[model samples]
Target: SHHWGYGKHNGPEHWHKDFPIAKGERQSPVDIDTHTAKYDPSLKPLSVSYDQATSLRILNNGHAFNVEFDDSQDKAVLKGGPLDGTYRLIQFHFHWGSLDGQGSEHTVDKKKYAAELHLVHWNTKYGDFGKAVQQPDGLAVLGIFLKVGSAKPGLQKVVDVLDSIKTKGKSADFTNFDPRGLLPESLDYWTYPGSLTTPPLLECVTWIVLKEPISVSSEQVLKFRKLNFNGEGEPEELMVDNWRPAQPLKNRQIKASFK
Candidate 1:
């Protein structure tokens, strides 16, 4: 998705205007409108076991502090290889706007979430996540949409680490935190081969958009949306308005497990 200016035309409502072709596409925010073509008759979304997945590393990737899985180095190594079974863990972060309530990729019933969290993992069944990104099925990204609320119980674990880095270009020493703990219990997702929304726009990822969104308090959403882009050498830039406009469907059909 392309980035829209604040107030000018940001968020889902403004996506179509930014990219006219998106007007008729089967866009996200697709509430559970279970229908014949949209039903996942036998779809059983993969449920990731957080306890079994370890090595949580939170990094200051310049854009945002990303959470990565390192403990499972062997598993990651194996999964990132030429096998179809597992995938290694990598870094994960989020995209947000300057505001506190609307910086996410997908929405629900036109409801913009407070934020979006992406857990990036690579499929060893192919190759490196970076390398696999070049193939049709190289990676699996769990997209968890978060809506801000006051004192949300779901995200307290993540919030406890906010103090690790309170300034720009800063990251905290995070440990003992299970990356899986951040995942919603539900595994329902929309599957499709799609490209990275970030630069290089690598067309190498298997998008698994979760059906259930995590809850974030309004204050939590505000925290991410209000970040600044003043990195090591980058000039002062508002952290808001970081999402890209939805790209073309490219004749791609997003398949849901329901149907």
Candidate 2:
């Protein structure tokens, strides 16, 4: 079995040793230089849909807390934007730092937010997520930034369940949650080709990172760090800074959906 974690032994710096795709031409969590991004008026608005009842369960995957959706059907999906087809929502997870100044896998002009939210989806043409994740244009992830300030009432439901899954492998029923309530006021974003910023970092993602950030209180952000990277019976490891540093841009072009 392969073991990977955010630490000196198995962090992003050492990921290429196990998953060579980590050093590929289109790795994720790249620094977005807005000033250099080209505005593309041809890009359409993003269309997102999430059936409240499709929310399955929330789990602590030893890396981040993931609220999975029932993707067996097209109950929750994303289309438009820079996508050529509909992408079903499989899961929505977050990456955060221990403090307010830093966190978030992808930065804007080298600026880090308190946390980052990723809504994972797969193209319909790929049949299933497993197959879609292996194709170059199979995945389209919608990324949202989380800043510290006002309490996020929409996220309180998620926060309330954290206590039940503080340890890895812990999970509980999580239903009737509409993920759309968690999005920012503006849908303006930047698009590019990238990879999953985790182990087995497949370079098959079309990243849609939002320009505006949603609000979450400092108290709620701290609760994320309380989670452990190990299961209940194993040695505990704080799940803080579970974010990969920005990778090289290479010859890629980051496009803006709006001016």
Candidate 3:
């Protein structure tokens, strides 16, 4: 069998076979059962600040498309909310499907959106991502759900670059882009302790999933499906449905910042 991927043979279902922790407690992309969410007033509104030039490049890593950033400086950071420390922005990526109704990893009342955007960050106290990736309070990932509606100008800037890196291991210049513009109007969110949605599945992330979703035209989502999961010479496979399904909520409490 090939390495872990979003294919029929080696998909999320088979991940636990390789990465035993895929079945571990505190795994991510948990379904947000609004009825059971605790209203946490103490959780401050989350704040994400990004330097205009922090974005470095956009690339197709076979698994997902990523917009890498310059995390060497403290210029771009995420603070407030459930986090007690400042976490530096590392990169942002997306997960989508061939159809409009099912791409987001996390679901609301078991409802899936057209897509999901994950902006990864690491706490500064750990010095960098390498060290932070394993600690309990070392990471904070801002999860923004993407709905199929109007065309988002900020997202267009990213989609526009996708054509350049259509295949795996491909990347292009994507600098001076401020990710803060991608946020929805509301800052309200559901916060919980979870792991990375992908493998390595370390239970180190504090997931801050926004309640309001940003819109992108259906045409844009179609474009994402055109992206190839293969390399230049390999058989072409559309990079659709690159998402891990919601895991167990075992002994975890999801805290809502609103209502």
- What ranking of all candidate models by lDDT puts the best one first? 3, 2, 1
TM-score of every candidate relative to the true structure: 0.73, 0.97, 0.98
| Superposition error at 10 for model 3 (Å) | 0.2
Q: Candidate 3 at residue 110, lDDT?
A: 99
Evaluated at residue 71, the lDDT of candidate 1 is: 33
| Best-fitting candidate, scored by TM-score | 3
- Cα lDDT tens digits, model 1, 134-209, are 7756766767877555465645665656555433566666566656555666766676666566544555666677
The true-versus-predicted C-alpha distance at residue 192 of model 3, in Å, is 0.5
What are the lDDT figures for the candidates, one per model?
Answer: 0.57, 0.91, 0.92
**Residue 214, candidate 2: how far off, in angstroms?**
0.4
Q: Which stretches of candidate 2 lie over 4 Å from their true place?
A: 51-53
Candidate 2: residue pairs that collide: none
**Model 1 / residue 230 / CA error / Å:** 1.0
